[PDB]
């Protein structure tokens, strides 16, 4: 139902206001203004859903907030039909926190089999306040008021990065376009609502490992963006007695008029003394959880709360859990084997950072953006926290034995690899193995999210325009040989990493492990004996799902599919492996197991005796190491032939 | 001109919006690159730097560029040939000037023009309610307004409590937030600085540097009395600028342009302000060297003029010589300093260092904190730490002065008796002699003169804002004196208040009390006939007051804060009375000299060989030391007779 989709709209307005605008029939009303009557029978089913007060965000990492979303979605998910779901939504909407309501709805599309996440509205069209700076939203309300007066039905407002921080004095602001990318922040929301740590254990396959894998890829790609910008790779925030050097001022205000808290430079990670105090958590508490978890990783087993020991291995027996998954569930934490011993490090860390401006709650303040999944990626400290988290996972990966020859062997030989950018501008054909990136404006209709009307009959639409990194489509072709006498199935596994570090030194195999990111991992049609060519288009990538919002549901943003690269051209490894055998691979499918038994990111998450990626690949005929150049264009038209006039004369052959 | 007063209204709206609402005839209009007044080139050429301050930021009173802009705009207003022309100029420039700069210039104009009276200016909270009322409350008002209009309701009242801006149970400084955030006190601060701006043409005020000292000394002293009433320790100067400011402050204020005031976390360093542009920066060690230079001048008894000559510092001046306290004040503020290059601009810049300490290198595109503006700075607990430092500099200077000689303290009139009596305020209770009370009472004002709450033009909506204030009953005092001479004698009575005991319960000696004395009433009497006379003064006549939520207009110590809070059990205060031989006193009069040649606060700002105030007063028949008790009532009706039936028995005589 596009009737269902309407429930996402105008989340800060009453159900009556939404219903009036949309011609939705309402259940009985009463005065709390006009508010729906909440049937006692429905209320009895709602668990803790109503316990979260209106006027604050959904704090996804907080136990009480997550339980409320889980409790509300439970009713939505268990509704006997979509018509009944629609009725329950309409009835409860006036009585639940709006962000909790929205989170529960999105989660419901992932959990219900008769709903598709691709049919949910793009998050920025629903909660534009989460992605657009305070001053721009305020400027839009102004422009709307004037437009209505002068009988203008449309207005467009826009902004630029030059307006939320000063790059010339703040190196971290150089990558704010990427951290603040509305599609990336929405992807983060989708990931956590598709794979919430509070999910009933068993209803996901390898969710702890997927937590590791998606965030590993998120951190790796961030670093590629940093290298593209002449920044040093992100440093883990691991010594928690050192103040967080780089603060962050989000410049965001919620639809309830609540401006998000900021964090000054040089703020300490401090004990959170909650209200009530008995709900508090402490830095040395998190440190001891970390100590316990490091011990378990180092000795190769966790202790179950039931007293038994659980082996950690990424070479499991049939029916045994993967060690990476067990560590992930313990670290997030989700379905931990022992909450009392290993704790809740990653989630609470978000809340410590998000409350660090007022950790003893003396000043009656809001949380910072680290406290919410749809905003946390904006903050540079997100990536310092996740580099720490990825370090824990890599610590575990290093305890695993290298893949054996048999574990890496394959029947298919990889013979060649070529990458070709598609046509994107007249009179230019990209040389082979060269990819480009550039900035392009995108515009969306914010009136689905914010009611800009002064009075009922006003006809006003506010469009919001801003710049996004983007790239032309590209394809690649893998040439393989099947030397056997029968048809062979294979999975192609393709990963990207920069060739050089920030010092210009070639990264060895060990260092590259921290960088490999998924380009495309998929099964081919059966390969006939002999030579075959397999061609994939960038829009088909395993990391994508299926107008400012190209891909819907849970998807790595298509516009951030290619790292920025540099004006001179930046060199990347393009690793290809042929191995014997519609949702984003980063997101998984709620109702299906991970098909592939190999660990996520295989084979490039384990140590090797080989010193270089070159030496590693040379050992295996089913692996090939290709190379591409990625070039950022400040002015895309620069690729065009310039006249003989205006042509530049070079001092040293090239200029 | 009540048409003049209208210019203060709806400061965030266009001139067209104001004129339309008020039926003001407009000059020619045009469309800016909406309807805006045409600004005559002839007027523009007269405006100096007034137009250089962009719309959308506050007036930053301590900043030299902002103050110059207010001075430049007010100049045109003040020099206008008539009030009709003044109104014309105001109407014409309103669309083209920063609104806070506009308002400041207008208030200053009432002080500076002889045909205008500051008492006729609107109360500041009715003009800029956003400066005094929390963000959440203004936003709640907008919501209540929208609903009211829809339901044909022409009036709405919103209110709030201190429990909503900080948590007293975890933040001792919040216990005195009611006083620091008192809207009348903050308005008084605005008035003081616009009546006595440091940028005034030198000579157009008498002893302005000394008045800067004196008003702030009284402001700090009264704050300390409020702290003692609340079982808080007296305020500590912020003097070692290497130490982070322990107590932060989150103002919870948002301007009418939607710009939320910056906050300051606990434990924030006082840091170099690297301005944009960088050449406009100032540095902590720079301020420290100005301080070193000033301490030196104070200690050796002279300042060095920028012309190379030395200027003696003395509070015993020759006729025609400046007062040392005045010279120090002008150097410290700074205002008409003898040597800007040597003594600097310590006090003003310190406000800006503190106000920008959340982002001192301007990396994060942020706004200033409340310390940057005169109408908000008093809210911040650090205001009083900064002013305790400032008062310490002034006291350092006062201590270099020789004690008053017998001749300087002698008088013809003898003080025989002193009595204080609270007026009637509740039926069936008469206050015992020498007992004063305080309690909290609500006050309400109409905010619709400041904020346009209309959705569309024809809406009839008024938003009242209600909140609690400290208050006290009227009181009077009577001084019994004797004139033992043979002719009529005129005298000035000088009455000061200070607590008797410090925070440790120890009797404060003479030296300690110097830091506490605050003006109660200083005034000249009618000539006193030979023999005995009784002089009775009502509290509403006090010299510290000027002449409905806003009792006294123009520049006045708040009547509601005239009496320190006191305690539930009753707190004891010295009430010092001196008879000396011959429009708030804190504000002075713009056009007239200080009539009294004695230093402000005489004789209780100099050292004495006498150890106690008792010993000091006993030496002089024209001085008497009285004592009063001040008792705060949580519930004012508690003073009433209770039913014999309901009285509870005490274990230890009293309970
Ligand atoms: C911008 O977005 C909103 C989507 O909510 C559109 O508003 C709808 O417009 C249709 C056609 O006028 C109305 O029938 C609906 O009642 C509107 N929905 C709501 C909730 O207001 C709007 O049309 C879009 N504007 C443009 C230019 O496409
Ligand atoms: C609240 O304050 C405003 C003063 O600004 C009053 O609004 C005026 O009301 C009169 C009478 O209706 C109008 O003619 C004026 O045009 C209004 N002025 C403005 C600027 O709107 C309002 O009346 C006050 N409300 C009460 C109850 O006193
Ligand atoms: C409002 O404006 C839109 C776009 O400007 C126009 O297409 C439409 O006819 C109007 N809608 C209504 C209901 O008046
Ligand atoms: C603890 O739980 C695990 C579940 O896998 C089980 O295998 C083990 O037997 C349990 N320990 C005991 C002694 O119950
Ligand atoms: C190749 O295919 C055979 C037959 O399916 C399979 O059993 C074996 O695992 C593969 N061998 C190699 C060389 O990896
Ligand atoms: C791979 O393909 C590229 C271009 O299509 C070509 O330069 C190269 O010769 C090929 N290598 C092999 C082994 O076919
Ligand atoms: C790839 O996706 C983008 C956005 O959806 C689209 O512009 C482009 O045409 C797509 N390419 C193809 C051939 O589908
Ligand atoms: C607005 O409402 C008030 C009462 O709240 C009323 O006195 C006044 O007449 C109204 N204004 C108009 C123009 O009707
Ligand atoms: C410097 O200024 C003072 C101010 O009174 C004046 O008396 C003195 O003559 C000046 N010094 C010189 C040398 O000009
Ligand atoms: C007392 O009055 C006389 C006459 O005016 C005056 O000279 C003297 O200064 C006054 N004060 C004292 C203490 O003598
Ligand atoms: C002062 O006045 C009070 C009350 O009016 C009286 O009781 C006391 O005796 C007086 N003292 C003198 C010295 O007159
Ligand atoms: C003193 O001022 C207050 C506030 O304006 C007023 O309520 C009281 O009546 C005044 N007292 C007298 C007697 O003027
Ligand atoms: O989890 Cu995805 O934000 Cu730390
Ligand atoms: O000066 Cu009155 O605010 Cu420091
Ligand atoms: Cl149901
Ligand atoms: Cl942008
Ligand atoms: Cl701590
Ligand atoms: Cl508590
Ligand atoms: Cl600069
Ligand atoms: Mg100090
Ligand atoms: Na909110």
Q: Answer whether A17 contacts ligand 1 (Cβ < 6 A).
A: no
Residue B281 near residue B275 (C-beta atoms within 8 A): yes
Calpha distance B592→B128 (Å, rounded): 30
Calpha distance A258→B135 (Å, rounded): 8
Calpha distance A375→A128 (Å, rounded): 11
Helix (H) or strand (E) holding B331: helix B324-333
Residue A379 backbone zone (phi > 0: left; psi -120 to 50: alpha; other: beta): beta
DSSP state of A253: B
Helix (H) or strand (E) holding B83: helix B83-93
Give how far the C-alpha of residue B404 lies from the chain's centroid of Cα atoms, to the nearest Å: 29
Q: Which residues of B are less than 8 Å from A135 in CB distance?
A: 258-259
Distance B22 CA to ligand 2 centre (A): 9
- Block residue for tokens 């039931």: A306
Question: CA B234, B240, B242: angle at the middle one, nearest 5?
Answer: 130
Kindly report the length of chain A: 655
- Decide: helix, strand or coil at residue B391: helix
β-pair partners for A263 = A248
Residue A271 near residue A281 (C-beta atoms within 8 A): yes
Calpha distance B44→B35 (Å, rounded): 19
Calpha distance B66→B53 (Å, rounded): 7
B34 to A146: CB separation less than 8 angstroms, yes or no: yes
Distance A232 CA to ligand 17 centre (A): 29
Q: How was this structure determined?
A: X-ray
Residue A296 near residue A331 (C-beta atoms within 8 A): no
Give how far the C-alpha of residue B493 lies from the chain's centroid of Cα atoms, to the nearest Å: 24
Calpha distance A412→A407 (Å, rounded): 14
Dig out the tokens for B142 from the structure: 């907008």
Dig out the tokens for B344 from the structure: 């600097």
Strand B518-524 with A154-158, pairing? unpaired
- Decide: helix, strand or coil at residue B73: helix
Count of Cβ atoms closer than 10 Å to residue A610 Cβ: 16
Considering all CA atoms of chain B, what is the largest pairwise distance in Å, rounded to the nearest integer?
83
- Block residue for tokens 């998924």: A518
Q: Where are the alpha helices (DSSP H) in A312-449?
A: 323-332, 339-342, 345-354, 380-398, 405-408
Task: Report which bound ligand comes closest to the CA of A153.
Answer: 3
Strand A301-303 with A309-311, pairing? antiparallel
Residue A138 near residue A443 (C-beta atoms within 8 A): no
Helix (H) or strand (E) holding A574: strand A570-580
Count of Cβ atoms closer than 10 Å to residue B583 Cβ: 15
Calpha distance A513→A1 (Å, rounded): 45
Strand A154-158 with A461-470, pairing? parallel
Burial class (CB in 10 A: 0-12, 13-18, 19+), A389: buried
Q: Answer whether A477 contacts ligand 3 (Cβ < 6 A).
A: no
What are phi and psi for residue A124, nearest 5 degrees?
Answer: -65, -25
Count of Cβ atoms closer than 10 Å to residue A602 Cβ: 19
B166 to A134: CB separation less than 8 angstroms, yes or no: no
- Decide: helix, strand or coil at residue B282: strand
Residue A207 near residue A194 (C-beta atoms within 8 A): no
What is the DSSP secondary-structure string of A425-443?
STT--PPTTEEEEEEEEEE
Min CA distance, B77 vs chain A (Å)? 30
Residue A105 near residue A583 (C-beta atoms within 8 A): no
Name the residue among B469, B502, B405 with its Cα closest to residue B179: B469
Q: Answer whether A9 contacts ligand 1 (Cβ < 6 A).
A: yes
What is the DSSP secondary-structure string of B574-643?
EEEEEEEE---TTT--TTS--S--SPTTTTTTS--S-SSHHHHHHT-TTEEEEEEEEEE-SSGGGGSPPP
Calpha distance A368→A386 (Å, rounded): 17
Strand A434-445 with A623-632, pairing? parallel
β-pair partners for A536 = A476
Calpha distance B261→B131 (Å, rounded): 10
Helix (H) or strand (E) holding A69: helix A63-78
> What are the Cα distances from residue A61, in Å, to A185, A354, A364, A551, B10?
15, 10, 20, 26, 43
Best residue in B363, B366, B381, B459 to probe A by mutation, most A CBs within 10 Å?
Answer: B363
> What are the Cα distances from residue B185, in Å, to A257, A314, B452, B556?
27, 68, 25, 9
Distance A519 CA to ligand 7 centre (A): 17
Instruction: Measure CA of the first residue to CA of the last residue in chain B; give whole Å.
Output: 58
- Block residue for tokens 């310390």: B371
Dig out the tokens for A149 from the structure: 């007066």
B167 to A362: CB separation less than 8 angstroms, yes or no: yes
Residues with Cβ within 8 Å of residue B265, at least 6 apart in sequence: A264, A267, A357, A358, B248, B358
Q: Which residues of A are less than 8 Å from B252 in CB distance?
A: 364
Helix, strand, coil abundance in chain A, percent, nearest 5 = 35, 20, 45
Calpha distance A83→A106 (Å, rounded): 17
Q: Answer whether A376 contacts ligand 13 (Cβ < 6 A).
A: yes
A361 to B248: CB separation less than 8 angstroms, yes or no: no
Chain B positions touching chain A (beta carbons under 8 Å): 34, 135-136, 139, 147, 164-167, 170-171, 174, 248-250, 252, 254, 257-260, 263, 265-268, 274, 276, 358-359, 361-366, 455-456
Question: Which residue's C-alpha comes closest to atom 8 of ligand 12?
Answer: B474
Rg of chain A taking only CA atoms, in angstroms: 26
Strand A434-445 with B310-312, pairing? unpaired
Calpha distance B156→A100 (Å, rounded): 31
Residues with Cβ within 8 Å of residue B168, at least 6 apart in sequence: B162, B174, B175, B177
Instruction: Measure CA of the first residue to CA of the last residue in chain A; give whole Å.
Output: 58
Residue A186 near residue A551 (C-beta atoms within 8 A): no
Calpha distance A286→B281 (Å, rounded): 42
Min CA distance, A622 vs chain B (Å)? 50
Min CA distance, B158 vs chain A (Å)? 16
Chain A positions touching chain B (beta carbons under 8 Å): 33, 134-135, 138, 146, 163-166, 169-170, 173, 247-249, 251, 253, 256-259, 262, 264-265, 267-268, 273, 275, 357-358, 360-365, 454-455
Residue A475 near residue A154 (C-beta atoms within 8 A): no
- Block residue for tokens 């660090």: A356
Helix, strand, coil abundance in chain B, percent, nearest 5 = 35, 20, 45
Distance A138 CA to ligand 3 centre (A): 23
Number of H helices, E strands in chain A: 19, 14
What are phi and psi for residue A341, nearest 5 degrees?
Answer: -100, -45
Dig out the tokens for B158 from the structure: 């919103």
- Decide: helix, strand or coil at residue A451: coil
Residues with Cβ within 8 Å of residue A104, at least 6 apart in sequence: A49, A69, A72, A73, A76, A96
Contacts 24+ apart (CB under 8 A), B166-170: B166/A362, B166/A363, B166/A364, B166/B250, B167/A275, B167/A361, B167/A362, B167/A363, B167/A364, B170/A273, B170/A360, B170/A361, B170/A362
Name the residue among B265, B362, B282, B499 with its Cα closest to residue A270: B265
After which residue numbers is chain B interrupted with C–N beyond 2.5 angstroms?
33, 547, 582
Calpha distance A588→A204 (Å, rounded): 9
Count of Cβ atoms closer than 10 Å to residue B421 Cβ: 16
Q: Annotate B498-512 with b (16+ C-beta within 10 A) or e (fewer).
A: bbbebeeeeebebee
What are phi and psi for residue B351, nearest 5 degrees?
Answer: -60, -45
Q: Where are the alpha helices (DSSP H) in A444-515?
A: 509-512
What is the DSSP secondary-structure string of B453-497?
--SSTT---EEEEEEEEEE---EEEEEEEEE-SSS-B-EEEEEEE
Residue A556 near residue A563 (C-beta atoms within 8 A): no
Name the residue among B566, B647, B499 with its Cα closest to residue B179: B566
Atom of ligand 8 nearest to the CA of B155: 5
- Decide: helix, strand or coil at residue A444: strand
Calpha distance A625→A603 (Å, rounded): 14
Q: Answer whether A619 contacts ligand 3 (Cβ < 6 A).
A: no
Calpha distance B247→B382 (Å, rounded): 7
Residue A67 near residue A52 (C-beta atoms within 8 A): no
Calpha distance A7→A15 (Å, rounded): 9
Name the residue among B221, B271, B314 with its Cα closest to residue B544: B221
What is the DSSP secondary-structure string of B104-165?
HHHHHHHHH-TT--GGGSPPHHHH-GGGTS-HHHHHHHHHHHHHHHHTT--EEEEEE-GGGS
DSSP state of B310: E
What are phi and psi for residue B49, nearest 5 degrees?
Answer: -95, 5
Name the residue among B20, B139, B181 with its Cα closest to residue B91: B20
- Decide: helix, strand or coil at residue B441: strand
- Decide: helix, strand or coil at residue A278: helix
After which residue numbers is chain A interrupted with C–N beyond 2.5 angstroms?
32, 546, 581
Dig out the tokens for B464 from the structure: 């009242």
Dig out the tokens for A615 from the structure: 């030496």
> What are the Cα distances from residue A468, in Å, to A183, A376, A566?
9, 19, 16
Q: Which residues of A are less than 8 Å from B260 in CB distance?
A: 134, 253, 259
Task: Report which bound ligand comes closest to the CA of A74.
Answer: 15
Name the residue among A554, A548, A550, A547 with its Cα closest to residue A582: A554
What are phi and psi for residue B195, nearest 5 degrees?
Answer: -80, -35
Domains of chain A: 1-120 (1.20.1370.10), 121-401 (1.10.1280.10), 402-640 (2.60.40.1520)
Helix pair angle (B284-300, B324-333), 10° resolution: 170
Which runs of E-coded beta strand occur in A271-333? 301-303, 309-311
B363 to A454: CB separation less than 8 angstroms, yes or no: no
> What are the Cα distances from residue B414, in Å, to A274, B528, B613?
62, 11, 18
Calpha distance A634→B393 (Å, rounded): 57
β-pair partners for B491 = B581
Calpha distance B562→B477 (Å, rounded): 14
Helix (H) or strand (E) holding A176: helix A176-179
Name the residue among B16, B24, B28, B33 with its Cα closest to residue B95: B16
Within 13 A of A202's CA, how many CA atoms are on the CB side? 1
Q: Where are the alpha helices (DSSP H) in B153-283?
A: 177-180, 183-195, 208-229
Strand B155-160 with B462-471, pairing? parallel
Calpha distance A374→A127 (Å, rounded): 10
Q: Annotate A134-160 with b (16+ C-beta within 10 A) or e (fewer).
A: bbbbbbbbebbbebbeeeeeebebebe
- HEC-encoded secondary structure of A629-649: EEEECCCHHHHCCCCCCCCCC
Calpha distance B190→B104 (Å, rounded): 9
Name the residue among A316, A399, A410, A407 with its Cα closest to residue A606: A399
Closest CB to B258 among A138, A169, A455: A138
B167 to A364: CB separation less than 8 angstroms, yes or no: yes
> What are the Cα distances from residue A12, in Å, to A26, A128, A451, A517, B190?
18, 12, 9, 38, 38
Residue B265 backbone zone (phi > 0: left; psi -120 to 50: alpha; other: beta): beta
Rg of chain B taking only CA atoms, in angstroms: 26
């Amino acid at each position: 139902d596009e009737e269902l989709r309407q429930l996402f709209y105008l989340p800060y307005e009453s159900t009556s206001t939404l219903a009036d605008r949309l011609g939705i029939q309402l259940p009985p009303l009463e005065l709390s203004t006009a508010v729906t009557v909440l049937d006692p029978e429905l209320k009895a089913k709602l668990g803790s859903a109503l316990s979260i007060p209106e006027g604050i965000p959904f704090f996804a990492f907080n136990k009480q907030h997550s339980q409320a979303v889980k409790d509300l979605s439970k009713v939505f998910i268990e509704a006997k039909s979509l018509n009944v779901l629609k009725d329950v939504a309409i009835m409860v909407k006036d009585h639940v926190n709006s962000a909790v309501f929205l989170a529960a709805l999105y989660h419901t599309y992932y959990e219900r089999k008769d709903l598709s996440p691709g049919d949910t509205p793009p998050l920025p069209t629903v909660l534009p306040d989460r992605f657009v700076p305070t001053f721009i939203i305020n400027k839009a309300k102004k422009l709307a008021k004037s437009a209505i007066i002068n009988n203008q039905t449309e207005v467009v407002v826009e902004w630029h990065s030059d307006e939320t921080g000063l790059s010339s004095r703040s190196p971290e602001h150089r990558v704010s376009y990427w951290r603040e990318d509305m599609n990336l922040n929405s992807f983060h929301w989708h990931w956590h609502l598709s794979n919430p740590y509070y999910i009933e254990p068993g209803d996901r396959d390898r969710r702890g490992e997927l937590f590791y894998y998606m965030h590993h890829n998120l951190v790796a790609r961030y670093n590629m963006e940093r290298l593209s910008l002449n920044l040093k790779p992100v440093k883990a925030f691991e010594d928690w007695r050192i103040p967080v050097q780089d603060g962050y001022f989000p410049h965001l205000t919620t639809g309830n008029g609540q401006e998000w808290s900021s964090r000054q430079d040089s703020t300490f990670f401090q004990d959170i003394r909650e209200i009530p105090l008995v709900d508090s958590n402490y830095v040395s508490q998190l440190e001891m959880w970390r100590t316990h978890l490091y011990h378990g990783i180092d000795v190769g087993y966790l202790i179950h709360e039931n007293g038994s020991y659980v082996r950690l291995t990424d070479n499991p027996e049939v029916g045994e859990d993967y060690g990476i998954n067990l560590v992930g569930e313990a670290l997030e934490a989700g379905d931990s084997v022992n909450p009392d011993v290993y704790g809740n490090i990653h989630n609470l860390g978000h809340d410590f950072l998000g409350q660090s401006h007022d950790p003893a709650k003396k000043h009656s303040t809001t949380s910072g953006v680290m406290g919410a999944v749809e905003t946390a990626v904006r903050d540079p400290v997100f990536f310092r926290w996740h580099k720490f988290i990825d370090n824990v996972f890599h610590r575990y990966k290093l305890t695993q034995p290298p893949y054996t020859p048999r574990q890496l062997s394959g029947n298919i030989t990889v013979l060649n690899v070529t990458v070709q950018e598609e046509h994107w501008i007249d009179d230019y054909v990209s040389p082979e193995n060269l990819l480009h990136t550039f900035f392009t404006p995108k515009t969306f209709n914010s009136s689905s999210g914010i009611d800009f009307r002064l009075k009922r009959d006003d006809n006003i639409t506010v469009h919001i325009k801003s710049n996004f990194l983007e790239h032309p489509d590209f394809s690649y072709t893998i040439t393989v040989n099947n030397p056997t006498s029968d048809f062979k199935r294979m999975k192609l596994r393709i990963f990207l990493a920069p060739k050089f570090d920030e010092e210009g030194v070639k990264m060895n195999y060990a260092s590259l492990l921290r960088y490999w990111t998924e380009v495309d991992v998929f099964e081919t049609d059966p390969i006939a004996p002999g030579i075959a060519y397999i061609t994939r288009h960038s829009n088909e990538s395993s990391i994508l799902s299926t107008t400012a919002f190209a891909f819907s549901g849970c998807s790595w943003p298509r516009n951030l599919q290619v790292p920025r690269g540099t004006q001179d051209g930046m060199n990347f490894h393009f690793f290809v492996m042929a191995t014997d055998v519609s949702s984003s691979s980063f997101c998984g499918r709620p109702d299906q197991p991970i098909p592939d038994p190999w660990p996520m990111g295989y084979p490039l998450e384990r140590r090797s005796s080989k010193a270089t990626i070159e030496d590693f690949v040379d050992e295996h005929p089913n692996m090939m190491l290709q190379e591409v150049t990625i070039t950022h264009l400040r002015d895309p038209s620069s690729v065009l032939r310039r006249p003989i006039s205006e042509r530049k004369e070079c001092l040293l052959f090239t200029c």
